[PDB]
Amino acid sequence: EFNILLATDSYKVTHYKQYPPNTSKVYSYFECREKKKYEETVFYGLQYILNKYLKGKVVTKEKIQEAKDVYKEHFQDDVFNEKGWNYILEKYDGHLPIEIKAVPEGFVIPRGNVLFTVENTDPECYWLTNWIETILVQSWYPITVATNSREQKKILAKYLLETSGNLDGLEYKLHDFGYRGVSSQETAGIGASAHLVNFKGTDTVAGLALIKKYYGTKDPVPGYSVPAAEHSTITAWGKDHEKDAFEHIVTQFSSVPVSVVSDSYDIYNACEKIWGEDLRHLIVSRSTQAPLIIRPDSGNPLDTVLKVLEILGKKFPVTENSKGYKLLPPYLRVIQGDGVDINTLQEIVEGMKQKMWSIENIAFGSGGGLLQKLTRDLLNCSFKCSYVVTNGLGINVFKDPVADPNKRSKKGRLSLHRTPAGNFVTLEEGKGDLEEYGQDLLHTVFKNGKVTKSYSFDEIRKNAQLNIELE
Amino acid sequence: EFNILLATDSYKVTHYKQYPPNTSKVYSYFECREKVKYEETVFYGLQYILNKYLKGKVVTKEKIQEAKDVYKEHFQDDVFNEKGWNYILEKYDGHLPIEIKAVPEGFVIPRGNVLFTVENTDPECYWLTNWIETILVQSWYPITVATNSREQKKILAKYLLETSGNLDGLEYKLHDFGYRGVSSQETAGIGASAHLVNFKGTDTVAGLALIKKYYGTKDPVPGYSVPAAEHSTITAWGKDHEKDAFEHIVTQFSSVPVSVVSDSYDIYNACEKIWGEDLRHLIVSRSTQAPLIIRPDSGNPLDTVLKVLEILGKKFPVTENSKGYKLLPPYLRVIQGDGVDINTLQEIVEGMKQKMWSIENIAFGSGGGLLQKLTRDLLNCSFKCSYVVTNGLGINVFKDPVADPNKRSKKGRLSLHRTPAGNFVTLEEGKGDLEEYGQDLLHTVFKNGKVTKSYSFDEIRKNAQLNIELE
Ligand SMILES: O=C(NCc1ccc(S(=O)(=O)c2ccccc2)cc1)c1cc2cnccc2[nH]1
Ligand SMILES: O=C(NCc1ccc(S(=O)(=O)c2ccccc2)cc1)c1cc2cnccc2[nH]1
């Protein structure tokens, strides 16, 4: 079972002995710190952590004893704050005396702004605010997946609009292939849910149950997929029977969309001779609601996509759309799901544009690039103490390392506001109390063991919309 | 609750319909596919997956109904194999009719070798082998963390041996700081445990319980830490009271090791004037068993380490060890825990060596670098079908994409052997049965719902030792 007393960085066990004596309040905040790309971030994922790990009776006698036993051996010393944890158990029935205020989930906020704050609500628990730093900071992951996914949606929207004149199908242009490529089952669910803030296509099934349990949608599910082959279902037929595999699969799935990986032996032969000649009659007969989606899966991504389109364009009837770009017939599409990250995505769509191919023709799958190849450094997600009260006096505190001004932190009590021009600003040093900038955009989402404000997945999706979608 | 029917890539739900008719066996294997770095891998983490997710009754009537209901919405159609899953429920009381063979955990094996194989044990469940691809392929993560951690240990060993003449303390030279920097609590535990295959220092407490539950150690715990400050326990004292904070902290922890982050405002001032003058009397009085460990945390990692050492060397009595390298007195050490990955680690120890500083003086902390900044591409961890039986006939199968020879997969039934020179070789096409290469080194680790062979964490550590440790 999960034990919050064992869910912190080891050294934090020792911090209750290190704060100034007579400290009654420790107040800390989280930001995606500005660095001297990724100018704005999607705030998403805190509600998951609040519900799964922080709410309700999270302290018990048994959990306190288990932590005491572990830390005795881990430190080879008795340094654990048993008294402090006992107090929470006795006084609050094991509920955390903490208040967390946060910007609404889905909100899109420029770098360098307060996203949430944490403070103790009982003077005895001054040490608790930063105990939970470690678990709260893991919100960096859904924030970063959601943000990077959104930035890819911006690229797709730009190129789809330019080559087609509209945004039809945008929400299915980047499919999550990352289940096998992430570090754990839990990460899979969290990451997939973050991608679904921006798109509707996922093969990472774990995301669906997470959204249903912690957020909720009006629709039965937040994400969708369609039938498709993998290399094993082609290669199992034997090297000389690739055509037989293709025919069997597209016939099994004749009335729904189906994707067929086509590079087991020779992608170019498969497109030109197998699909383009031998089995063409099974392709040209398909419904617009049930295309074949050809999937290359190796070679230089841009070079391969362009060559595949070039081949298909000569075996199938291509049209020129009203923007002047080439368009495959509606029963035939392509998905590139190898080597796709934000950089290569951009390279591929720009390459297609240069060769006069509409982005209507293609969709992308991304796995490791979408869900695993991300770190806390990308957006400088960071949690810092900005305000303490000692001997009844509040003091504004901060770090400001001489050799790195980028690591300077904010001072005092913080609040988030709209500017007169409709942008965002974080006020420091309690200046929000002057009420010169309208209402604080941070809302209490957690207090004394209870989740106090929640958002549905639908609301989050609404908040995270692109400007171009809004327009 | 976890549901194995919902723990696969969506498209695999549709694969049972795509294999050749009358296929009775699907046999697949995992390797770290061959491409100058990472020539050998540490096999670790499958035992966790087998126990947490695959063993025992993993199919229930309720789980089948849940999956059916989810997939109907996710695919907007009825494509889920209810019959196949009901078969497993009724015939085997929901135990998976699968056999997995694997190399022992902790084993260090060159790239491009079979590490584990999977096949179904009931002809009706031919589809099951690749259903569990997704969950098994997540073994990439503990393998990759353990491997990259071990590669860092090789660097540290080389330089510690050169500069000091021995390997004392090697096992505490790379400390895990990665708890906040990984993508989930589950990942935290898995990754921390993988690092502990090589070292004993961790702040990622989640790793301890995972090891205790799934592997086991003779010792009470597999990993250790010591008291230490964070920026908040320094900055909370106020900007003008950094000295007061330092004095309080080292006095509270006067007889155990303590690390104190010293760069809140000016690391060089902190080292030269606060530690080196104002509080020097509190440092030179400490026990060899209780050093102060000074922690810089910003600036260029190499330049900052070198400058910190130069400052301390002029304020404290430095000796020259038997190798001719400079050594701080035993009550004083440094830890660099900012910007550390395998590359910067190498740069720092080489720079220290060039400046005649012993590696005895320093330890490293690594967070995102150690546990998060890794992907499945680093070692090319991959699962592929190599052998099928259809119409009673076994066929060797494989992919071999024309544009990427590096993605070619192995053919037929596989086995792992010792060569005459004592190295590893993987035999394909069932050739292990020719008995020209002695016994198969893989062991059956899972069969029909039961874990059939397992390893303690102590044995895994022994298997993963460096050659230099063995010498
Ligand atoms: O083909 C796969 N999944 C099915 C699949 C999803 C989306 C698409 S699409 O073109 O975006 C699309 C979306 C919506 C409606 C129609 C078409 C095609 C097919 C798969 C490969 C793979 C590789 N690695 C890991 C996991 C994977 N899933
Ligand atoms: O200081 C920290 N932990 C305690 C800490 C562990 C090991 C060391 S050591 O020098 O390797 C050492 C090991 C064994 C015996 C003596 C000395 C020093 C101090 C910390 C910073 C941080 C930053 N980010 C995240 C999480 C962190 N923990």
From Swiss-Prot, chain A:
Pfam families: NAMPT_N (PF18127), NAPRTase (PF04095). Pathway: Cofactor biosynthesis; NAD(+) biosynthesis; nicotinamide D-ribonucleotide from 5-phospho-alpha-D-ribose 1-diphosphate and nicotinamide: step 1/1. The modification Phosphotyrosine is found at residue 172. GO terms for molecular function: cytokine activity; identical protein binding; nicotinamide phosphoribosyltransferase activity. InterPro entries: Aldolase_TIM, DUF5598, N/Namide_PRibTrfase, Nicotinamide_PRibTrfase, Nicotinate_pribotase-like_C. The modification Phosphoserine is found at residue 456. Its main location: nucleus. It is found in: Nucleus; Cytoplasm; Secreted. Beta-nicotinamide D-ribonucleotide binds at residues 203, 295-297, 337-338, 368, 376. Changing residue 203 to N/S: No effect on activity towards nicotinamide. Alters specificity, so that the enzyme acquires activity towards nicotinic acid. Diphosphate binds at residues 180, 231, 295. Inhibited by FK866. FK866 competes for the same binding site as nicotinamide, but due to its very low dissociation rate, it is essentially an irreversible inhibitor. Keywords: Acetylation, Biological rhythms, Cytokine, Cytoplasm, Glycosyltransferase, Nucleus, Phosphoprotein, Pyridine nucleotide biosynthesis, Secreted, Transferase. Transmembrane segments: none annotated. One of its GO terms (biological process) is NAD biosynthetic process. SUPFAM superfamilies: Nicotinate/Quinolinate PRTase C-terminal domain-like. It comes from the Eukaryota. Its EC number is 2.4.2.12. It catalyses: beta-nicotinamide D-ribonucleotide + diphosphate = 5-phospho-alpha-D-ribose 1-diphosphate + nicotinamide + H(+). One of its GO terms (cellular component) is extracellular exosome. Expressed in large amounts in bone marrow, liver tissue, and muscle. Also present in heart, placenta, lung, and kidney tissues. NCBIfam families: PRK09198.1. Catalyzes the condensation of nicotinamide with 5-phosphoribosyl-1-pyrophosphate to yield nicotinamide mononucleotide, an intermediate in the biosynthesis of NAD. It is the rate limiting component in the mammalian NAD biosynthesis pathway. The secreted form behaves both as a cytokine with immunomodulating properties and an adipokine with anti-diabetic properties, it has no enzymatic activity, partly because of lack of activation by ATP, which has a low level in extracellular space and plasma. Plays a role in the modulation of circadian clock function. Homodimer. This is Nicotinamide phosphoribosyltransferase. The gene is NAMPT.
From Swiss-Prot, chain B:
One of its GO terms (cellular component) is cell junction. SUPFAM superfamilies: Nicotinate/Quinolinate PRTase C-terminal domain-like (SSF51690). Catalyzes the condensation of nicotinamide with 5-phosphoribosyl-1-pyrophosphate to yield nicotinamide mononucleotide, an intermediate in the biosynthesis of NAD. It is the rate limiting component in the mammalian NAD biosynthesis pathway. The secreted form behaves both as a cytokine with immunomodulating properties and an adipokine with anti-diabetic properties, it has no enzymatic activity, partly because of lack of activation by ATP, which has a low level in extracellular space and plasma. Plays a role in the modulation of circadian clock function. The modification Phosphoserine is found at residue 456. Its main location: nucleus. Pathway: Cofactor biosynthesis; NAD(+) biosynthesis; nicotinamide D-ribonucleotide from 5-phospho-alpha-D-ribose 1-diphosphate and nicotinamide: step 1/1. PANTHER family: NICOTINAMIDE PHOSPHORIBOSYLTRANSFERASE. Keywords: Acetylation, Biological rhythms, Cytokine, Cytoplasm, Glycosyltransferase, Nucleus, Phosphoprotein, Pyridine nucleotide biosynthesis, Secreted, Transferase. Belongs to the NAPRTase family. One of its GO terms (molecular function) is nicotinamide phosphoribosyltransferase activity. Gene3D superfamilies: Aldolase class I. The modification Phosphotyrosine is found at residue 172. Expressed in large amounts in bone marrow, liver tissue, and muscle. Also present in heart, placenta, lung, and kidney tissues. Beta-nicotinamide D-ribonucleotide binds at residues 203, 295-297, 337-338, 368, 376. CDD domains: PBEF_like. Its EC number is 2.4.2.12. This is Nicotinamide phosphoribosyltransferase. Inhibited by FK866. FK866 competes for the same binding site as nicotinamide, but due to its very low dissociation rate, it is essentially an irreversible inhibitor. One of its GO terms (biological process) is positive regulation of transcription by RNA polymerase II.
